[PDB]
């Protein structure tokens, strides 16, 4: 693992059903030369994989997301802004984590729970179990 700029946010508390939007940014050659992707760790429980871009091709990437999160988490690039985003529409009881951001040679890598920078402080998620009814 090697030290690689890391800024992660997004995170926050929401109600079950509701929504956030994650950003992981990094430098500019590390960005588009590695797969980026998005991992989570919930008390008690293993870090896990959530969601992965593979490295740039000439003109594009391709995506993965974890099955438990199919539909709901969309992950993308905006390449102008160096930035990996996680779109979780829908949120459950059961994605509350701090959630990561990391890089690989290659999504196969990161889909296995693979990683090779060291990771930085997270973003914290809180679902919750609802809201007041009006």
């Known amino acids: 693992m090697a030290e690689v700029q890391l800024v992660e946010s997004g995170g926050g508390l929401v109600p079950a059903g509701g929504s956030l939007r994650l950003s992981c940014t990094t430098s500019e050659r590390a960005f588009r030369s590695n797969a980026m992707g998005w991992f989570r760790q919930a008390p008690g429980k293993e870090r896990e994989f959530v969601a992965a871009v593979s490295v740039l091709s000439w003109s594009g990437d391709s995506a993965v997301v974890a099955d438990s999160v199919a539909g709901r988490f969309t992950i993308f690039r905006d390449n102008a802004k160096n930035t990996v985003y996680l779109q979780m529409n829908s949120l459950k009881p059961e994605d509350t984590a701090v959630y990561y951001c990391?890089?690989?040679?290659?999504?196969?890598?990161?889909?296995?729970?693979?990683?090779?920078?060291?990771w930085g402080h997270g973003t914290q998620v809180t679902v919750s179990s609802g809201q007041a009814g009006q």
């Open positions: 990391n890089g690989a040679s290659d999504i196969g890598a990161l889909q296995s729970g693979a990683s090779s920078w060291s």
